[PDB]
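Teaching note: in complex prediction, the entire set of molecules is handled at once rather than each chain in isolation. The prompt given to students was simply: 'Predict the structure of this complex.' The entities are:
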Amino acid sequence: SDTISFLRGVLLKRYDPQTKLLNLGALHSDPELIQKGVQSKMFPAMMKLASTEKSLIVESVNLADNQLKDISAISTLAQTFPNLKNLCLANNQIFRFRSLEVWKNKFKDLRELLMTNNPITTDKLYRTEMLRLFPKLVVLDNVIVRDEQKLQTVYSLPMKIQQFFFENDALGQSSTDFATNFLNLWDNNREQLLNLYSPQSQFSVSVDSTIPPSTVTDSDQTPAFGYYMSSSRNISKVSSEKSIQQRLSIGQESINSIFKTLPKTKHHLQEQPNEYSMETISYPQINGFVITLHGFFEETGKPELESNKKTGKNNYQKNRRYNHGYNSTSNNKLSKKSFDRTWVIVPMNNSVIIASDLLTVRAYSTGAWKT
Amino acid sequence: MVMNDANQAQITATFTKKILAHLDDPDSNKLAQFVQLFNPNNCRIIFNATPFAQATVFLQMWQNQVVQTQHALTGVDYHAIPGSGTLICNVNCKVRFDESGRDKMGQDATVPIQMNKPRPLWGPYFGISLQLIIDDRIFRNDFNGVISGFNYNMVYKPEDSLLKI
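The expected output is the structure of the full assembly:
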């Protein structure tokens, strides 16, 4: 609206585009504000507007010469600019630390700070607090306190994550041709894939039940692995060995027995395809190759056979067990889930056949190879 | 001959928990031991999708420019390939790095121009999905040159971690 628009206007004047710096000092001296006539409460306001402007990127902030004695007034700085990198609050009369402790391990990207003429500078302990408050700081009071790179040699491994890898173009590209053939048939028709499976081939399902941290972008905090926990073969999760001997499936009939238990999927592969990092690597002694794939799929359908209706809860009246009324991991809904799949294929003159098939399903989460 | 017995399955669980321990030790003199498990003649590591020709050089990497780590198993499963005499195991685990600000040797970033060692401060959890290729002699209680494949890759990461991937 027009009434708030002036507060938006003053930020434009006090932000310098080319130098990428936002000078905030002497707020009350804005000539455009005087025609209104003018407290101690406006400081949180801007900060909210700065995030929602969506047109200016700030990475340096000057806030000296504002007449402050306590830092609680600006505590909302960490909530708007986590990647701020150059703060100047010099020429102030702060003298204690309880109001500055609010930024513990925050402003990690910040690596330059000017706090000249402050009373804190005379203390002997002056060096110690920052050294933990801002681990990546390098320059303080225009004097070097850390050896730049020496820093950026610890906090960063010496290469960059690659989303695809393969020894040769002929081998690598052929695997993608296999993967496209394998996955598109997977969603549409389960019956045809038997011809790629040997009587010696073995298949298993592994389920990871860990909850991804909340800091991961687009993290799934309510996973639902209901249909997979009757067929999951996890060594460290279940200790009932007897069950593990039954989870493993060998042969043509056994593999398709599982294939109907799992719900129908549909991947946005060759469309959205930045997501599906895959590596393939040779298998010398058996003259085969190993294809490891990481990605996600959409459970668009439900399994035809429940496997818990023809034999499960055979006694009538009484329902199953933990009342799937939201209980347990939380249910058996239908929803997006990530997966890690590895392959072992032995080539043949007629056609390739799959030796082993491992499938690992986990809660949905973003990839690390993103940009 | 699809061999599948519970006795063999137990050995796989402890062996995977054993290899991770060597990767987690900030020691340096003991590091020569972990080399013996890797195959000296032919071996094919892969760490975050960059190939390493030699296994020995990849271990001096883990001690020189990599901070202390602390893994945490969550899921393991395996499959024995008939005729091959080798088996493949799928491993999932978490990862923490010491974000205190010094490396394994114990040298800080501040330049010297002039109580014991502080306890390390750990960071957020990461995500790992590890595939490795082993032969079947591990069942026979011998661990010399038994590792032939090692695909250590990560699938997700948090934004709060100081490490840049």
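Point out the following to students. Chain A touches chain B through 70 residues (CB under 8 Å). Chain A has two domains: 1-154, 155-371.
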